[PDB]
Amino acid sequence: DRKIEFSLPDLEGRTHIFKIHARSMSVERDIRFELLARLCPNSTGAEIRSVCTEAGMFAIRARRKIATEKDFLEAVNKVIKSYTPRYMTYN
Amino acid sequence: TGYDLSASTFSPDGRVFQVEYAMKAVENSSTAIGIRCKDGVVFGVEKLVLSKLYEEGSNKRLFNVDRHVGMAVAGLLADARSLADIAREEASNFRSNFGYNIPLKHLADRVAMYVHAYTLYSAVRPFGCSFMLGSYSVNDGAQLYMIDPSGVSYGYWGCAIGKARQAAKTEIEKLQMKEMTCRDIVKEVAKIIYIVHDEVKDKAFELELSWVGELTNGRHEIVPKDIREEAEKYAKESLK
Amino acid sequence: SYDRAITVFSPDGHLFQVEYAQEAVKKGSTAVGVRGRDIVVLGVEKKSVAKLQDERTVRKICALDDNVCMAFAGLTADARIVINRARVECQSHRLTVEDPVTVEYITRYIASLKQRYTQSNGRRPFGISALIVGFDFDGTPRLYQTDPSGTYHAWKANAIGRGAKSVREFLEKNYTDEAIETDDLTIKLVIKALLEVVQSGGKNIELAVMRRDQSLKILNPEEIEKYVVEIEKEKEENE
Amino acid sequence: NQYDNDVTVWSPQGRIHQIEYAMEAVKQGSATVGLKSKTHAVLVALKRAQSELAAHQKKILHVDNHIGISIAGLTADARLLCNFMRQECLDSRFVFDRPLPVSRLVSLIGSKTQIPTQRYGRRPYGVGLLIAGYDDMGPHIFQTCPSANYFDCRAMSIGARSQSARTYLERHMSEFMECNLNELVKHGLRALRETLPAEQDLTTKNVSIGIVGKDLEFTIYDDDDVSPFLEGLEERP
Amino acid sequence: ERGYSFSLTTFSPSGKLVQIEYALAAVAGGAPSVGIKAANGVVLATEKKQKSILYDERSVHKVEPITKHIGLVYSGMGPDYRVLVHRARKLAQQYYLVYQEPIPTAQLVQRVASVMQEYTQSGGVRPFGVSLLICGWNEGRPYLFQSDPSGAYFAWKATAMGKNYVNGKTFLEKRYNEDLELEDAIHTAILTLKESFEGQMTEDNIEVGICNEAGFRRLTPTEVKDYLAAIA
Amino acid sequence: EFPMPNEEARARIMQIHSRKMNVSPDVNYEELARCTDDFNGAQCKAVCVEAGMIALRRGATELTHEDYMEGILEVQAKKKANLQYYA
Amino acid sequence: RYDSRTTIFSPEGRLYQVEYAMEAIGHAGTCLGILANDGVLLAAERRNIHKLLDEVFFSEKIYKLNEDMACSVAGITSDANVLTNELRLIAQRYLLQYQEPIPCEQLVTALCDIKQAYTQFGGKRPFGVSLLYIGWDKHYGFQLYQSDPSGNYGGWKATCIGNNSAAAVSMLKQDYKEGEMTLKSALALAIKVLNKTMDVSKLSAEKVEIATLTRENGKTVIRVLKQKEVEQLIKKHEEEEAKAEREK
Amino acid sequence: RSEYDRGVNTFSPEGRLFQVEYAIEAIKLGSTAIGIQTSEGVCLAVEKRITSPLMEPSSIEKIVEIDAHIGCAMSGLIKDAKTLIDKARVETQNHWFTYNETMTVESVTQAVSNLALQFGEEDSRPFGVALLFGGVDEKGPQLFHMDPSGTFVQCDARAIGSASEGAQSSLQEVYHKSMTLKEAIKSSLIILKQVMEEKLNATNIELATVQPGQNFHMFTKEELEEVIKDI
Amino acid sequence: LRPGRIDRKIEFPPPNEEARLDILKIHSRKMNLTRGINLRKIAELMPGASGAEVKGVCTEAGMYALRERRVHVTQEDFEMAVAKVMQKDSEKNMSIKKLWK
Amino acid sequence: PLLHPERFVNLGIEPPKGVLLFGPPGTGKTLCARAVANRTDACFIRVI
Amino acid sequence: SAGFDRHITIFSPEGRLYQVEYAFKAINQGGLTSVAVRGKDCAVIVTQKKVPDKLLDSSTVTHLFKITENIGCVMTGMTADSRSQVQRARYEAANWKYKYGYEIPVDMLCKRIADISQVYTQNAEMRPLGCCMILIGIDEEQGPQVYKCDPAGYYCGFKATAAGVKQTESTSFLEKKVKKKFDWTFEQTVETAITCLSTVLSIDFKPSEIEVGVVTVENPKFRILTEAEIDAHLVALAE
Ligand SMILES: Nc1ncnc2c1ncn2[C@@H]1O[C@H](COP(=O)(O)OP(=O)(O)OP(=O)(O)O)[C@@H](O)[C@H]1O
Ligand SMILES: [Mg+2]
C-alpha cells in the first residue's frame, strides 16, 4: 500500500549521518561535518560510513589516535572523488 | 505500434494511424449537429459547462467564419479555434481577391486542404477537431459541409459530430429536412440535442443554437434568445 | 545516456561531450609554455617523424600575428582551422582598430569560437587546447591556455597534452622569480620541463622563443643541443 | 507510454499527453484568485519566497492600463506571454488609439499558444494566466490554460491548492456581482486564504492585489499597500 | 553490422556506405538492359514487358533521347529514371547554351553522375534506385558509359544490367568482337536479351535504339520486327 | 473485461472508500478523478487511505481536498516541492 | 556505441566515424608516389581490369589539377570526383586572384580544410577519400603531399595508399636512398614496389598507371606513361629479378 | 525520468522541465559566492578555488565589473557566465546610450534573464550559471540573484555555489536589516571561512563592495589581509 | 590470451611455395605420379593457398584419374585440379567493385 | 497501528498493511527494517 | 528486413521501398473500385458511388473530378489525398496552358503528377498521396487516351485499366475481354466497363451507386452521365 522512497540524503541528512557514524570515532572537536556533508554531493549513508571508516584508517596509518579534519578530507577524496581539466570549466 | 508514432508513416496495411487517433479525439467530444432546412442551415451544439464558474457563453463552439458562413466545431477546442481563424483568413482572402462571398463548397474545400496538409508531415500533427460549415444564399441555396481531421469534406443534408454522433444520426433520419423551414427545425434541433445527452455522466450543459437562411437574409448569426427559449421549451416537452 | 548530445545536461549538471572533447587534448604531444620578464618560450615535443616524411608540414607551433604565437594539442585538423581563424581575426582586428591585436583579445576570440562550436548539435567541439603567448601587451609578457570547452586562463607557466600533469607539477615545484630572471635560465627551464616526459635525444624538443618587440625564433637543433648540454653540466655539478 | 515525448504525437485514446503535462505545470505555481464585480475585476495572488530573506516573487504583472494578469506556472513562459500581451496592447494603442478589448487579447493568446501545441520545435506555454481588465463590455476575468483553451470566468482560481479557492468562489458566486471594491477584494482574499494550510496565514508580505475598475486603472498592491485590504478580514475558524 | 544499414551519412566499422549497395541491389533487381559499342555505332536494348496486354506499350519508352546524339537506357526504378532523364536533358541543354556545341558524352555522363551523387550525401534523400547506360557518338568514335547511384561512371564496351545480368555478361566476352559493326551489334543485343528474356520477344516487348554517327534514334517496332525475324 | 476505472468510476471508488471516514463536504471528487489518470481501484482506495493518514498527521479531525491531493501524490511515491523556476 | 554521427566524441576523445573512414581507405586500389631529385611521380593499380571495360580517359586514378600539379586518388569514386572538381576550382580561383601557380601546400591545405569542415559539421559524413599530391612550385620545388579523410596532411618523400599500404611503405623506407634518386631510379623502385604490393604476378602493364612530373625549361610537363614505356619498365624489372636470382 | 530529461522541450508528468533542474545542479559545482545587501551598500564575497599556483589569480573571474555601479558574482559554467556577463555589460551600455542614465539593478538583471530565457524558444540549452547582481541605484543598494531558468528575485543576502545551503542557513541566522557594511563584510568572511575546505587567507577569496557614492570596489591583496585579520 | 594462460601464440600462416611443395609431396606419396610430374610447378600454380587446398588438389587430381578409370595421374590432372579447387568467387557486379576507385 | 489502534478506529482509518522500501543501494532501507525489528514488540518475521 | 519499413527514403536489403508499397495498400482503404476502358473513339470510366447514409448529399460524394474540359479523372484511394492530388493536377494543367498555349496532353499531365509523387517518395518530407489517379481525354493524332498513374510515380498508357480494392480480378476480366478484337463503340465501351465492375463486384448495379464519365472523339469534353443515361446503358446491357 505505502511505497516509501529512500532517496539520497540532503545536506542536513548527510550531516546527521556523519554525526551518527562518528559518535564512537576518536575525532577532534573542530571537525566541520557540514563541510564534509557538502563534499559528498550524491552519496548514500553507506558511503558516509565508508568515509568515516577511511578517515579512521588514515589517522591509524600514521600513528595518531585522533582523526583530524584533514583525515576526513582525505577519506572523502578517496571514497567519493577517487571512485581536474573537467573541473576547470566550472567556477 | 511502431507505425503510429508519426503522421507521415504508412501502416503495413496502409493507413495513417495518426489521423485515426485524431478522429478518436473528436469522438471523445460532445455532440454537435447541423440540419439543412428547405431554405437554410441550422446549427446546434451541446456545450457542457465544465465548472459553474464559467460565464454562460465562454469557449463557445459556434464560430462565424464569415457573414454567411457558420462553423459548429466539435473536438479539441484550441485546434477548433485555430481552424476558425484559418477559415476566416481564407474567406477574407477570397473576398479580397475575387470581390464576392466565397462559395461554401470552395471554402470547405480550401479549409479541408489546409486540414489535410497537416496529416502529411511528421513535424505537425493532424487537427483534433471536426467542424461543419453552413451557409445560405439564393444563388446557390443552402449548403452544409462537414470536415473531419482527415480532410475529407462532402455536403450533408444533416450531420452530427461528437460523442453521441450515432444516436443523433438515428434521430435525425426520422426528420424530413428536405421540406421543413428553419423555424420549427430549430425546435427540432433543440429536441435532438436534448435526446443525445447522457445527463448522468455529463453534469450539465448550456444549449446554444445558430442558423443561416432566408429568414436571416442570407447571413449567419446567433439564434435570437426570444426564440431559442421556445426551442428549449419544445426540447423539455420531449420527455428525454 | 547523457553523453550523446552536446546540449544535454547530465543530472549532476555535466556537459559530458565537452569533457570528451577535453579527453582528445590529453592524447596530443605535450606543449610547455612559461613566460619570463623579457621572454616567452613555447616548448613542444616532437613525435619522431617517420624516416621518409618531411617535418616542414607537421608544424605545431605557429604564430597568429607578428608577435603572438600558439602551440596546440589534440587533433591537427581542428588546430589548423583554429589557427587560420585566429590569423584572420588578428588581421581583421588590426583593420578595424589600428592597434596591434592583444594576446588577451586573440585568446578571448579563440575561446569564443570554441564556445560557439560547443553550443549546439551538428557542430563538433574543437578538440584542441591552445597555449597562446605574446608581448602584445606593449611591454608586458602574457601567457594563456584555451581549453576546448571555451574557457581561457592566464598562467605564469602551464603544460597541455600528454604528460601535462607531470610538467605542471615540475613547474609548480620550481617556477620561481630567480628561475626566470634571465632569458637563458627561462629557456633552460623549458628544457628541463620537456625532458622528463619526452625522454629522447635531439630533434624531439622544439622550442619557440620570442623576445620583446621581436619576431618568433624557432630554435634550431644546434641551440637546443647547447642548452641540453648546459643542463647536463648543471646536473653533473649538482652530483 | 511511448506517445508521451512530443506534442505532435496522438495517444491511442485520442489525447496529447504533452499538453496534459503542460496543464499540470500550472499546479506547480502558487494559488491565484481572480474575480470580478459589476464594476471591478480584482485578482489576488499568493507569493512564495525561495529563502526567508529573499523578496517574494512577483506574481501579478502589469500589461496595460486596462489589462492585468496573475501568473501560475513557468516563469519563462509567463514572462514571454506577458511581453507578447504588452506588445499587442501597445500595438493596438498605437494603431487604433483605443484600449485593446480583453476578449481580443485573450483570443490572440489562445492563437499564439496553440502553435506550440501542434507543431514540433517548442514546448507548450506551460503557464496559466488569470487575465483581468476593463473594456466597453464590463470587467473580464479570463483564465488561459497552457492547452491554448481559455475560459471566461466570473471567479477563477489556478495554481497549487486552488481547489479550495475555487470551491469558495463557487459558494459565494451570487454576491460577487453586487459588491463594491472592498467586499470584492475581501472575497478574493478569503478565497486565497482557503488555499493556505492551517499554520500559514494571509500576511502583508506574501499577498499581491491587482484591481482594474470603472475609473481605476490597473494597480498592483504589494507589501504595505495590501494592509488596507488585509485589515478587517475575519479570522479563519 | 545491422546497426549501420540505415543511415546514408554514416560509415560502417568496415567502412561501407550500406545504402549505396542496397540501391545497387534494387538496381540489379530491375528489368534487363544490355548495351554494346560497335566500331561504327552503339546499340542499346532493354526488354519492355507489361503485366498485361492491357498496357499501352508505346506510351512509356525505356529508351529515351537526351540530345540528337545521346541516348538513355536504364535498369531499375522507372520513376527515378524519369527525373534522371529530365536532369540529363537539362544538363545537356545548359552545356549547349554555354558552349554552342552538342555536349560531349563523357561530359554528359560526368554531370549526370554528379547529379546522382548529389542524392547520396545527406539523410532524408534516397539514392537513385536506377543505373543508367549512356550511348554517344563524339569526335567520330562511339561512346558507352554506365552511371550508378554511387556516382561512379565507367566506359563499358559492352555490358548487361538488371535481372540476370550475370548471364548477360557471360554471354558477352563470348559473342562480342571488338571489330563488329552496327547490325552485328544489334543482333548481339537481341540474343543477349533473349537469354535474359522470359517468353516470346514481341515487337512490343523489346525496345532498342542505335546511336551511330547519324545520331540516336529509337528503332520503330517495324525495324525491331525485321531484326528479330532475321535473328529468329 | 475489467477495464481501468474512468473518471466517473474513479470518483465513485473514492466515494465508496471514503464512506467510513469523516470527510469534508467541500471535497470535489470530480477534480480528484481528473487528477488520478491511470489509477486502478486499488490505487484509488490507497488514495483515500493516504488522505486519511495525511489528515491524521496534522491532527485534523476531518479530511480536506488538499489532503486527498497529497494522498494522490503519496500513492505514486511522488514528492512535491516548491520548484525555483515554477512561479 | 559512439559512432552514430561524426560529431560524437568517444569518452576517450576519438572521432569514431573519422577512424572508420580512414580504415575504409584500405579498400581502395594501391596508389603510391616517389619523390626524386629531378622530379616526382605517381603509381596506381587498376582494380577493374575487365576486358569488357574500355579505357577512354586513361586517367581514372591520376588527375591533373593545375598546369604544375597532379593528384592520385584512392577512396570512394563519387567523393573522389567531388574532391578533384573542388581541387580544380580552388586552383583556378587562386590563379585568377593571384595570377601565379599555387604553391602546392596551399591547395592541399584548402582540401584539408574542406574535409575537416565535413568531419566537424553535423549531417555530413567524412570524405572517404585519401589522395596523394604531386607538384612543383617556386618556394620548395618538387613536393609529395598526403591527404587523409580527416583532413590531416603531411609532407612525404614516398608513400602508398590503398591495398597492402603498410608493406609497401615499409619496403619504401627500407630501400629508398634520400637525395640520391633520379626519375629513372624512382620509376624502377615504383615498379619493384608495385610488383609484390599487389598479389597479381608478372605486373601487367594494363593493370598499372604511372604519371611523372618533370621540370623542363620552366614548363612543368605532366606526363602519363603510355603502355610501351610501362611494358619496358616491366621487362627491365623482370630482367633485374632474373639477374638477382643468378646469385642463387 | 530518462525519457523526459533529454531536452528542454519535453514536459515531465509532474510538469517539470527536467533540463532546467540539471542546469541548477550545474551551478552547484561552482565555488561558493556570497552577497549581502545592507543600507550602507552591497558586498560580494566568493571562494577563489585555485587549482594551481602557476595560474594568475586574476585570470579566473568570479566578481566582475558589469558597470561602474553594478558588480556580478559568478557560480557555475565559465563560458555561460562570460556570455551572460558580456550581455549585461552590453545592455547597460545600451541603456546608458539610449536613455543617458545608469540602468537599475532590476533592469540589468531582467535584461540578463531575457537572454537566459531563450533556452530553446526558437530565437539550445539553459545557461548553467547563477549570477549575483549587486549594486546601488536610485532605489539604493540592491542585490539580485538569477538562476539558469531566468527566474530573478531581489535577495537581502543570497549565497550561491557549492556551499549555497549551509552558507545560506548561517546567513539567515546572522543577517539583520540594520547591518552596516563593515559588519556585513566581517559576517560574510566568517561564513566563507566556515564553509571553505581550505584555510581562509588572502589568495583564496576575492571581496567586492558597491556603496552609494563610491564605485565598484574589488578588495586588493592588502585590503583583503586587513579585513581577514580580525575574523 | 594473456600470458600465464596462453604462454605462446603460434601462428600458422598459409604455406609458402616450398611449404606447398612439401605438402604436395606429403599428400601425393601414395599416388602413382607419372614420369612427367613436376610438383614444384603445381606449388607455383597455387599462390596463397592453404594446406587443405593443397591436399584437395591431390584429391581432385586423383579423382580425374578415377573418372578416366586409371590409377596414375599426369601433370594435366594436377593443373586442372589446381583450377577446380582454387576457384574463387568475385563480386560479379562491376557496380559494387567501382564504388571504391 | 499496532501500538495505538485507537487513533485510527475513531476516525475510521484503515492503516496500510504493507510497505515497499525502495531506493538506491546503501540508502538505509535494511537499516530501517532492523530498527523496526528492534522495537516492534510483536512477531517480526524475516523471510529468507 | 522488417526494420526498414519506417522511413520512405530507406532501402530494403532486397532493394525495396516498403513505404511506397504501404501507400499502394492504402489505396484499397476506400473500399471502392474504378475501371477505365478505351474505345476506338471514346474513353469511358465508371466507379462505385457508395453512400452508406441517407443524410449524405449524393451530389457531393462524386469521385469524378474534372481536371479540365477535355481531361477527366476518377480518383480511388483515400479521399483527402485524392482531392489534394486533383487540385494539384488542375493547377498543373492551368500552368501548362498559361505557359505553352495549347492544352496539356493527358499523358504529360499526370506524368507531371507522377513526377510530383516521385519527388515526394524520394525526399522524406511528406507521405506519398495514398490515392491512384486515372486520367482520360481525347488527344489529337492519337485518339482516346486513358492513363493510370500511381503514388510511386509510375505512369503508363492503358487500353483498359482499373484501380481499387478489386483491381486484380477486374484486370483479369479485362484481359479476358480485351483479347477479342471487336468494334469498341461508345455503347460497347460503357457496357463492357459496367460488366467489368458488376462481375468483379457481383452486384446488380442499381443506377444510384454507379457514376460514369466519358470523353469521345465526336464530343471531346469530359461529361458525367446522369441517372437517365446510366439507367439506359444498364438496360441496354441486360438485353
Ligand atoms: N540514513 C542512514 N543513516 C545512517 N546510516 C545509514 C543510513 N543509510 C545507510 N546507512 C549505513 O549504511 C549501511 C548499509 O546500508 P543498508 O544495509 O541499510 O543498505 P540498503 O539501503 O538496504 O541497501 P541494499 O540495496 O544494498 O540492500 C548501514 O549499516 C548503515 O550503517
Ligand atoms: Mg538491504
What domains does chain B contain, in order, with CATH numbers? 1-238 (3.60.20.10)
Q: Is-contact K47 K35, C-beta < 8 A? A: yes
Ligand 1 centroid–CA A49 distance in Å is 9
| Helix intervals (H) in chain D | 17-25, 75-96, 102-114, 163-171, 173-177, 181-195, 227-230
To the nearest 10 degrees (0 to 180), the angle between helices G165-175 and G183-197 is 140
Q: Is-contact F39 F10, C-beta < 8 A? A: yes
Which residue in this structure is represented by grid cell 538505509? J28
CA distance between the termini of chain I: 38
Nearest alpha-carbon partner for H144 in H58, H13, H36: H36
**Grid cell for residue C30:** 605535450
> What's the CATH number where E92 sits?
3.60.20.10
The contacts of residue G135 (CB under 8 Å, 6+ apart) are: G40, G66, G68, G69, G70, G102, G104, G107, G142, G143, G145, G213
How many of the other CB atoms lie within 10 Å of CB of E222? Answer: 9
Residue H160 φ/ψ, nearest 5 degrees:
-130, 155
The number of CA neighbours under 13 Å toward the Cβ of C208 is 24
Whole-angstrom distance, CA of residue B45 vs CA of residue B74: 8
Residue H65 φ/ψ, nearest 5 degrees:
-90, 95
Torsion of CA D216, D222, D228, D232, to 10 degrees: 120
Chain centroid offset of residue J46 CA: 13
- B116 by Cβ neighbours in 10 Å (0-12 / 13-18 / 19+) ranks as buried
Which residue in this structure is represented by grid cell 602584445? C136
Range of the domain at G98: 1-246
Torsion of CA D3, D8, D14, D17, to 10 degrees: 60
Nearest alpha-carbon partner for E23 in E62, E75, E88: E75
Question: CA separation (Å) from J29 to A7, A79, G228, J39?
Answer: 10, 22, 87, 16
Which H or E element spans position D32?
Answer: strand D32-36
Whole-angstrom distance, CA of residue D112 vs CA of residue C106: 44
Range of the domain at E181: 2-231
Q: Is-contact E190 E231, C-beta < 8 A? A: yes
3-class DSSP string for chain K? CHHHCCCCCCCCCCCCCHHHHHHHHHHHHHCCEEEEEECCCEEEEEEECCCCCCCECHHHCCCEEECCCCCEEEEEECHHHHHHHHHHHHHHHHHHHHHHCCCCCHHHHHHHHHHHHHHHHHECCCCCCCEEEEEEEEECCCEEEEEEECCCCCEEEECEEEEECCCHHHHHHHHHHCCCCCCCCHHHHHHHHHHHHHHHHCCCCCCCCEEEEEEECCCCCCEEECHHHHHHHHHHHHC
Q: Which residues of G207-238 are buried (b: 16+ CB within 10 A; e: fewer)?
A: bbbbbbbbeeeeebebeebeeeebeebbeebe
Whole-angstrom distance, CA of residue J8 vs CA of residue E136: 98
Tell me, yes or no, if H17 comes closer than 8 A to chain F by beta carbon.
yes
Whole-angstrom distance, CA of residue D9 vs CA of residue E72: 45
Nearest alpha-carbon partner for H113 in H154, H78, H61, H68: H154
Which one-letter amino acid corresponds to residue H147?
D
Whole-angstrom distance, CA of residue K149 vs CA of residue K156: 6
Tell me, yes or no, if E178 comes closer than 8 A to chain G by beta carbon.
no
Question: CA separation (Å) from K159 to K140, K171, K178?
Answer: 17, 11, 8
Binding site annotation covers J40?
Answer: no
Which H or E element spans position G170?
Answer: helix G165-175
Domain locations in chain D as residue ranges: 1-234
Chain centroid offset of residue J9 CA: 18
Query: What does G98-109 look like in DSSP terms, one character per residue?
Result: HSS---SHHHHH
**Grid cell for residue K6:** 519506417
Which H or E element spans position B216?
Answer: none
Torsion of CA K195, K196, K199, K200, to 10 degrees: -160
What is the domain count for chain K? 1
Determine how β-strand D207-212 pairs with β-strand D155-158.
unpaired
Whole-angstrom distance, CA of residue C61 vs CA of residue B213: 86
Residue G26 φ/ψ, nearest 5 degrees:
-60, -20
**Grid cell for residue G2:** 559512439
Whole-angstrom distance, CA of residue I63 vs CA of residue B103: 90
H156: left (phi over 0), alpha (psi -120 to 50) or beta: alpha
Q: Is-contact H181 H41, C-beta < 8 A? A: yes
Which H or E element spans position B114?
Answer: helix B104-116
Whole-angstrom distance, CA of residue D40 vs CA of residue E103: 82
Whole-angstrom distance, CA of residue E131 vs CA of residue E127: 11
- Order of strands across the sheet that contains D67-73: D60-64, D67-73, D127-135, D138-144, D150-152
Chain G stretch 138-197, residues whose beta carbon is closer than 8 A to a beta carbon of chain C: 140, 143, 145, 150-159, 169, 172-173, 176
Tallying the residues shown for chain C, one arrives at 239
Which one-letter amino acid corresponds to residue H67?
D
R_g (Cα) of chain C, nearest Å? 18
Per 3-state DSSP, chain C is made up of helix, strand and coil in percentages (nearest 5) of 40, 20, 40
Dump strand ranges (E) for B37-186: 40-48, 62-64, 70-72, 74-75, 129-137, 141-147, 153-155, 158-161
Which H or E element spans position J9?
Answer: helix J6-9
Residue nearest to atom 8 of ligand 1 (CA): J28
Tallying the residues shown for chain A, one arrives at 91
Which residue in this structure is represented by grid cell 463594491? D180
Ligand 2 centroid–CA B16 distance in Å is 50
Question: CA separation (Å) from G118 to C116, C121, G7, G147?
Answer: 17, 14, 10, 14
- J39 by Cβ neighbours in 10 Å (0-12 / 13-18 / 19+) ranks as exposed
Which atom of ligand 1 is closest in space to residue J34's alpha carbon?
18
Nearest alpha-carbon partner for D64 in D156, D7, D125, D140: D140
Whole-angstrom distance, CA of residue G135 vs CA of residue D176: 92
Taking CB atoms and an 8 Å limit, are F87 and D71 in contact across chains?
yes
- H142 by Cβ neighbours in 10 Å (0-12 / 13-18 / 19+) ranks as buried
Dump strand ranges (E) for chain B: 32-36, 40-48, 62-64, 70-72, 74-75, 129-137, 141-147, 153-155, 158-161, 205-213, 220-222
How many of the other CB atoms lie within 10 Å of CB of F25? Answer: 6
Taking CB atoms and an 8 Å limit, are E155 and G56 in contact across chains?
yes
Whole-angstrom distance, CA of residue C107 vs CA of residue C130: 9
Query: What does C173-204 look like in DSSP terms, one character per residue?
Result: HH--TTTTSSHHHHHHHHHHHHHHHS-S-TTS
Q: Is-contact D51 H155, C-beta < 8 A? A: yes
Binding site annotation covers J18?
Answer: no
**Which residue of G lies nearest to E160 if distances are taken between CA atoms?**
G52
β-bridge mates for residue G158, sequence order: G34
The contacts of residue I54 (CB under 8 Å, 6+ apart) are: I15, I20, I23, I24, I27, I46
Judge if the beta carbon of residue A78 lies within 6 A of ligand 1.
no
The contacts of residue B62 (CB under 8 Å, 6+ apart) are: B43, B45, B70, B71, B72, B208, B210, B222
The DSSP code for D74 is: B
Whole-angstrom distance, CA of residue G198 vs CA of residue E227: 46
What is the domain count for chain E? 1
CA quadruple J21, J24, J25, J26: dihedral sign = negative
Q: Do chains D and H touch (3 or more CB pairs under 8 A)?
A: yes
The DSSP code for D153 is: B
Judged by DSSP in three states, B234 sits in helix
Whole-angstrom distance, CA of residue E45 vs CA of residue E218: 10
Question: CA separation (Å) from E67 to D90, E147, E180, E217, G233?
Answer: 63, 17, 25, 10, 44
* Residues of F engaging H, defined by a Cβ cutoff of 8 Å: 78, 80, 83-87
Whole-angstrom distance, CA of residue D40 vs CA of residue D211: 7
Whole-angstrom distance, CA of residue D26 vs CA of residue D32: 11
Whole-angstrom distance, CA of residue E75 vs CA of residue I57: 41
Angle at Cα E191 formed by Cα E186 and Cα E195, nearest 5°?
A: 150
Query: What does E166-225 look like in DSSP terms, one character per residue?
Result: HHHHHHTTTS--TT--HHHHHHHHHHHHHTT--S---TTTEEEEEEETTEEEEPPHHHHH
Nearest alpha-carbon partner for H134 in H196, H208, H185: H208
Whole-angstrom distance, CA of residue I90 vs CA of residue I96: 11
Pocket test for ligand 1, best of J20, J30, J34 (most atoms within 8 A of CB): J30
Determine how β-strand I32-33 pairs with β-strand I72-73.
parallel
Q: Is-contact C199 C42, C-beta < 8 A? A: no
Chain centroid offset of residue H110 CA: 14
How close I93 gets to chain E, by Cα (Å)?
8
**CB pairs C-G closer than 8 Å:** 104
CA distance between the termini of chain C: 55
Q: Is-contact H11 D25, C-beta < 8 A? A: yes
Q: Which residues of K56-73 are buried (b: 16+ CB within 10 A; e: fewer)?
A: bbbeeeebbbbbbebbbb
Tell me which CATH code domain D1-234 carries. 3.60.20.10
Judged by DSSP in three states, C163 sits in coil
| Helix intervals (H) in chain C | 16-25, 76-96, 103-117, 164-174, 183-197, 221-238
Angle at Cα G138 formed by Cα G132 and Cα G142, nearest 5°?
A: 35
**Which residue of A lies nearest to C161 if distances are taken between CA atoms?**
A85
Which one-letter amino acid corresponds to residue A49?
R
Determine how β-strand B205-213 pairs with β-strand B40-48.
antiparallel
Chain centroid offset of residue D208 CA: 12
Range of the domain at K226: 1-239
Ligand 1 centroid–CA F43 distance in Å is 29
Q: Is-contact H76 H170, C-beta < 8 A? A: no
Judged by DSSP in three states, I16 sits in coil
To the nearest 10 degrees (0 to 180), the angle between helices A45-61 and A69-76 is 120
What is the domain count for chain G? 1
**Grid cell for residue E99:** 558552349
Query: What does chain F look like in DSSP terms, one character per residue?
Result: --PPP-HHHHHHHHHHHTTTS-B-TT--HHHHHHHTTT--HHHHHHHHHHHHHHHHHTT-SSB-HHHHHHHHHHHTT------TTB-
Chain centroid offset of residue B83 CA: 12
**Grid cell for residue E126:** 534516397
Judged by DSSP in three states, I76 sits in helix
Q: What is the resolution of this structure in A?
A: 2.8
Angle at Cα K224 formed by Cα K218 and Cα K230, nearest 5°?
A: 100
Q: Is-contact B190 B225, C-beta < 8 A? A: no
Whole-angstrom distance, CA of residue H64 vs CA of residue H48: 13
How many of the other CB atoms lie within 10 Å of CB of I14? Answer: 14
